[PDB]
Amino acid sequence: VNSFSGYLKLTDNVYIKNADIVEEAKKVKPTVVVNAANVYLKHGGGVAGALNKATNNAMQVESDDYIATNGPLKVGGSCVLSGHNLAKHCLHVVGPNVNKGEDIQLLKSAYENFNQHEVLLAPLLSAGIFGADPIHSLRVCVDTVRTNVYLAVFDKNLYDKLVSSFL
Ligand SMILES: O=C(O)CC[C@@H]1CN(c2ncnc3[nH]c4cc(F)ccc4c23)CCO1
């Protein structure tokens, strides 16, 4: 038993809710919240901009030190950093950004990072400003993640479409 509430169950291990991941994180305080990161950990907009703003920019400060030490992530890769006031940990995962021409096949590699964590609160990778089809992203999630994932979908309209079209 865990504290996630109001989710629709899609499969044995994948759950979905119309929710603001920031508000969901502040209420649940999950062990892991997933950020929709880029390779530079520049949290300017989308999910990343919203999560960073909710930490009063502490996520960005920590991220800049990480990059100065380690260099950029790989597309499809991840790193674990603090969850600040939102979660114990933040798993920064880089899905491919279609608006940069990155290979959509890397979406499966991005979701594989979730399997290193038993339970996660997450957005749909490569959705939103990353330019992928959220329905494809949901399919890859279900077919790749084996650990327990709670997906927060900000837009009510997209949420309804994802549920109604789910196979
Ligand atoms: O941008 C991509 O491709 C990655 C996928 C994201 C998912 N994302 C969100 N998911 C869940 N909660 C969210 N709260 C937000 C508050 C904001 F100010 C902006 C975005 C979100 C947001 C919406 C945009 O797409």
The C-alpha atoms of residue 78 and residue 111 are separated, in whole angstroms, by 10
**What is the separation of C-alpha 65 from the centre of its chain, rounded to a whole number of angstroms?**
21
Count how many Cα atoms sit within 13 Å of the Cα of residue 152 in the half-sphere of its side chain.
Answer: 24
User: 40 exposed, middle or buried (CB, 10 Å; 0-12, 13-18, 19+)?
Assistant: middle
Atom number in ligand 1 closest to CA 152: 11
Does ligand 1 have an atom closer than 6 angstroms to the CB of 104? no
Determine the distance separating the centroid of ligand 1 and the alpha carbon of 131, expressed in angstroms: 12
Tokens of 72: 């950029």
Q: How far lies 8's CA from each of 14, 19, 127, 135, in Å?
A: 9, 12, 19, 16
Annotated domain spans of the chain: 8-165
92: β partners: 35, 79
Q: How was this structure determined?
A: X-ray
Asked if 92 and 73 count as a contact pair (C-beta separation under 8 A), the reply is: yes
Spatial CB neighbours of 146, under 8 Å, sequence gap ≥ 6: 13, 115
- CATH class of the domain defined by 8-165: alpha beta
Q: Helices 58-70 and 46-54: crossing angle, nearest 10°?
A: 120
Question: Quick one: residue 96, left, alpha or beta (phi over 0 = left, psi -120 to 50 = alpha)?
Answer: beta
Which residue intervals of 12-133 are DSSP H helices?
A: 21-28, 46-54, 58-70, 106-112
The percent of the chain in helix, strand and coil, each rounded to the nearest 5, is 40, 20, 40
Atom number in ligand 1 closest to CA 124: 5
DSSP at 11: S
Question: Quick one: residue 43, left, alpha or beta (phi over 0 = left, psi -120 to 50 = alpha)?
Answer: beta
Q: List the residue whose alpha carbon is closest to atom 25 of ligand 1.
A: 128
The C-alpha atoms of residue 29 and residue 6 are separated, in whole angstroms, by 16
Q: List the residue whose alpha carbon is closest to atom 22 of ligand 1.
A: 47
Count how many Cα atoms sit within 13 Å of the Cα of residue 138 in the half-sphere of its side chain.
Answer: 24
Tokens of 158: 């997209």
Among 113, 117, 96, smallest CA distance to 105 is for: 96
Does ligand 1 have an atom closer than 6 angstroms to the CB of 76? no
Residue whose entry in the numeric block shows the structure tokens 């629709």: 8
Q: Determine the residue type at 20.
A: D
Best residue among 17, 100, 154, 159 to mutate for probing ligand 1's pocket (most ligand atoms within 8 Å of CB) is: 154
